[PDB]
Amino acid sequence: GVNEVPDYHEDIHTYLREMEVKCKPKVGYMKKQPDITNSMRAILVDWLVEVGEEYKLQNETLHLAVNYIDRFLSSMSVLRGKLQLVGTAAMLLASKFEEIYPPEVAEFVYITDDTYTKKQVLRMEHLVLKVLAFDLAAPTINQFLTQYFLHQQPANCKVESLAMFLGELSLIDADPYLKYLPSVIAAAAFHLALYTVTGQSWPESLVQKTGYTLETLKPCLLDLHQTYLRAPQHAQQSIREKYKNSKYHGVSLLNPPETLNV
Amino acid sequence: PGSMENFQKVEKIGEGTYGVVYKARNKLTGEVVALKKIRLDTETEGVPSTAIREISLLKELNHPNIVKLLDVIHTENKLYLVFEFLHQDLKKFMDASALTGIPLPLIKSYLFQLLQGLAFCHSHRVLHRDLKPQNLLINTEGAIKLADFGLARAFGVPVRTYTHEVVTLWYRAPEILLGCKYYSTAVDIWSLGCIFAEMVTRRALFPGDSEIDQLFRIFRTLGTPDEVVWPGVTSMPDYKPSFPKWARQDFSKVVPPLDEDGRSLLSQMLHYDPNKRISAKAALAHPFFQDVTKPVPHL
Numbered sequence A: 001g002v003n004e005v006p007d008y009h010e011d012i013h014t015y016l017r018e019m020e021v022k023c024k025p026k027v028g029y030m031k032k033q034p035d036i037t038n039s040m041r042a043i044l045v046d047w048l049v050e051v052g053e054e055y056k057l058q059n060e061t062l063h064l065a066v067n068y069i070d071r072f073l074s075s076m077s078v079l080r081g082k083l084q085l086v087g088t089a090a091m092l093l094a095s096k097f098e099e100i101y102p103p104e105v106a107e108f109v110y111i112t113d114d115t116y117t118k119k120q121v122l123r124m125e126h127l128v129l130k131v132l133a134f135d136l137a138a139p140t141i142n143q144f145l146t147q148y149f150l151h152q153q154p155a156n157c158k159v160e161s162l163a164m165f166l167g168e169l170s171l172i173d174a175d176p177y178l179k180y181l182p183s184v185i186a187a188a189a190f191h192l193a194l195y196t197v198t199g200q201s202w203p204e205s206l207v208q209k210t211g212y213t214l215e216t217l218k219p220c221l222l223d224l225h226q227t228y229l230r231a232p233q234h235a236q237q238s239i240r241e242k243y244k245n246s247k248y249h250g251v252s253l254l255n256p257p258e259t260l261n262v
Numbered sequence B: 001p002g003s004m005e006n007f008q009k010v011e012k013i014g015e016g017t018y019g020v021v022y023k024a025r026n027k028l029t030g031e032v033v034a035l036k037k038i039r040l041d042t043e044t045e046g047v048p049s050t051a052i053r054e055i056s057l058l059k060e061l062n063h064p065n066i067v068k069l070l071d072v073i074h075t076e077n078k079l080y081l082v083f084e085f086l087h088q089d090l091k092k093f094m095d096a097s098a099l100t101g102i103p104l105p106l107i108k109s110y111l112f113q114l115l116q117g118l119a120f121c122h123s124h125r126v127l128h129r130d131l132k133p134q135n136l137l138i139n140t141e142g143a144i145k146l147a148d149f150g151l152a153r154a155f156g157v158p159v160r161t162y163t164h165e166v167v168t169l170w171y172r173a174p175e176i177l178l179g180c181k182y183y184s185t186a187v188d189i190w191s192l193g194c195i196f197a198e199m200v201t202r203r204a205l206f207p208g209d210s211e212i213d214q215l216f217r218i219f220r221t222l223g224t225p226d227e228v229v230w231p232g233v234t235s236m237p238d239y240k241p242s243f244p245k246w247a248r249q250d251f252s253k254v255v256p257p258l259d260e261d262g263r264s265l266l267s268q269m270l271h272y273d274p275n276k277r278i279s280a281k282a283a284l285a286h287p288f289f290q291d292v293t294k295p296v297p298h299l
């Protein structure tokens, strides 16, 4: 019914596909950042995961914030001492965009341990808005995932939660997920989730919707599959901790499959 | 791309939440614009979420039936939204079109354009969520455009739970009034439905003074809904069995001057069940519009 917008779902999907290309960060920006690294970004993203858990924020908000961070770091050189200020302003903006009840600015100041002032946070908010030119309605992995979900026959909450988890893991590591579009990571995540839980594969019906096959997703899948296998050892662990919760059907406790068989 | 030194203020023309709207003139190009000032010096939480949604969503919606945001002047204590100027809103026009009434060609033209604008919104994952005549701007050429996207929201598919009790009450869809967990594009259609009726009668179709009075006014016109007309209704969070059960009056009594085609379209806009309620896209093909044109306003 109308909650799945049947008269507009195609138009929307087509429009997000176009917009994900426009809202895309530069794949090679870390090497051009003098003072920050993939590892510093991973620490930041893993922290924003924890911030969303503490403030009971939508998963969509987290994804928006990272989109904003990556786009910002694509044109703006940032000292490591200021990396977190950017991420805080990013999470505030995402929250004001996406959440019914965003946390107050004071709360954002508080989660930074008074590293930064309220004045610093509000000034970085204006800068990110200037650098992004207010282009905040960015497609996220989640917006694709939720549409992919409508193709499940039948629907499996473990499939859905496990896809959310995997897509979320991908936020942590610019190498190699900066090279892949939201829509392609969501497709890898959905297939990997479906295969893990039920043994089934990317459906004919999503080939029709997306144009993606297992042929075209294979690069992101091989990466995502490694990230899943290695996730217990990753230095960042907030996402796994998060997906132990029953809210997400404890999907981080499922065993990854050893092999994908193409 | 712009600066306030090339604008000349002319007169106040309105008010939003974050301040006044001003008519101004670009001194280099001649263009007439509306300036919406958003207070930031007074803002202790930074840029308002209303403004962030308004600006981000409007930069993407380039359509002839959506008010065009031309520019954003980001000073340090001030934020100025530059829109194309339109002369009047639909509410002012309806009040000045009394005694004569709005001519059907123009009602039909305006409704048609409104549907084009809303459909374009819905096609770009955008709910307007405050459609009412005060927020629909008309020009001297015959255009009408959706405006005030301050309560608007980017939706995902399927929708999740968004802010409750949105839409000015007289225009709020029943599924919001019943506190449903999820609402979708159909809430905007409901608003246009009310507006359609309103253009014909020049008075609001459901002028309630409370959420419950609003429901009861709706029920007394469309009949109290049950599981047959609207499966789920008796389960909705704020459905109550004690609701009086009113008969659906014949729909030709709701808006007597309306013709067969108009009635058909209005009934489909005010269907209880958000799943059966017509979409903006489908409504464009309805025979009501078989002879539609774009005439200038008569006044």
Ligand SMILES: Brc1ccnc2ncccc12
Pocket: A010, A205, A208, A209
């Ligand atoms: Br067939 C076809 C084409 C485009 N999109 C589609 N989405 C879902 C199911 C089938 C589709």
Ligand SMILES: Brc1ccnc2ncccc12
Pocket: B013, B014, B015, B016, B021, B034, B036, B067, B083, B084, B085, B086, B087, B137, B147, B148
């Ligand atoms: Br014209 C115009 C554009 C934007 N907002 C407006 N608010 C009030 C009156 C006219 C407006």
Ligand SMILES: Brc1ccnc2ncccc12
Pocket: B284, B285, B286, B287, B288, B289, B290, B291, B292
């Ligand atoms: Br525009 C237009 C032109 C001709 N016939 C039409 N029928 C229905 C809706 C719009 C129409």
